[PDB]
């Protein structure tokens, strides 16, 4: 019952009608609790509670040892094949396909790959730079050849040379613009192709945040329960003192009267 209250507090879904069912559950427990106190002796109930408490402590210790063992076994350990298909493994399910848990890569390992990729780009730059220098030299040689053929000293030849240089400049500049646009297209396509991946990361990021909130809510509940249990303990001591005081002050004096 308490767990159900807890899960609800955490899941904020106040379905309208759940209160009738809660009251009933609460009443059911009250009836059961009452029955327990009618059927058995207080001495036996408390004894039972003591035992339940010991069991609960032993369970916690076992869990401590088991989780310590899971942290020290960082992976060298080889998949020992042990055999009988005995346990169903159903547990609360069945589930555990997942353990690809290959050692998630470390920041160091990823960042190393990043720098390796950066070097690939720098290497490509050097290659293209060498190609551009060869082409520039080849173009200069060709322009000089064309200028030598138009050197017949006539005003028309000079103007024809200027017109050539101007047409050539236009073609080169068109070529540069088209190339840059082309490159921009590539960069856009690349960014567009990764846009989905980024959305996914955003979702993950939201999930991480949501999850952080959830952890915080849970943490608050834990703090409440801690306080709650401390208070209950004091109350149990008070309640015990009230019943004893009633017997001493109000019942024990009657036989004399």
């Amino acid at each position: 019952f308490l767990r159900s209250l807890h899960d609800d507090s955490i899941s904020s879904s106040v379905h309208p009608g759940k209160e009738d069912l809660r009251s009933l559950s609460h009443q059911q427990w009250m009836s059961m609790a009452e029955k327990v106190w009618n059927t058995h002796t207080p001495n036996h109930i408390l004894a039972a509670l003591e035992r339940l408490t010991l069991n609960s402590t032993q369970e916690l210790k076992k869990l401590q040892f088991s989780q310590a063992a899971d942290l020290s076994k960082g992976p060298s350990c080889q998949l020992k094949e042990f055999s009988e298909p005995i346990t169903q493994s159903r547990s609360c399910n069945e589930s555990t396909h997942l353990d690809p848990q290959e050692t998630l890569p470390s920041f160091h390992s990823l960042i190393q790959e990043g720098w390796a990729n950066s070097v690939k780009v720098s290497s490509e730059l050097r290659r293209v730079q060498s190609q551009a220098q060869a082409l520039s030299e080849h173009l200069a040689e060709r322009i000089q050849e064309i200028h030598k053929k138009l050197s017949d000293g006539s005003e028309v030849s000079v103007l024809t040379r200027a017109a050539f240089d101007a047409e050539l400049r236009c073609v080169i500049l068109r070529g540069c613009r088209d190339a840059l646009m082309q490159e921009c297209r590539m960069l856009q396509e690349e960014a567009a192709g990764k846009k989905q991946e980024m959305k996914l990361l955003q979702q993950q990021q939201q999930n991480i945040q949501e999850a952080c909130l959830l952890l915080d809510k849970k943490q608050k509940h834990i703090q409440i329960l801690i306080k709650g249990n401390s208070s209950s303990k004091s109350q149990i001591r008070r309640s015990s003192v009230e019943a004893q005081k009633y017997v001493q002050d109000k019942l024990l004096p009657w036989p004399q009267e």
Binding site: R126, A140, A162, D165
Partner: protein, 55 residues
């Protein structure tokens, strides 16, 4: 078996040499470009001067 282990060691030495050789080649390549850029600043100014044909 021992021969196979020896082969791995040889390969490791070879890859290590390759990484260090590559590092040296890049150090020379950046020194040569810094010397060439100092020389080439002089030549490029010349050719764009053909725009000054006013009289």
């Amino acid at each position: 078996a021992l021969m196979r282990m020896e082969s791995l060691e040889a390969e490791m030495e070879e890859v290590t040499e390759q990484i260090l050789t590559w590092r040296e080649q890049q150090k020379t390549a950046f020194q040569m470009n810094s010397d060439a850029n100092s020389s080439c600043i002089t030549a490029q100014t010349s050719y764009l001067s053909i725009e000054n044909l006013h009289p």
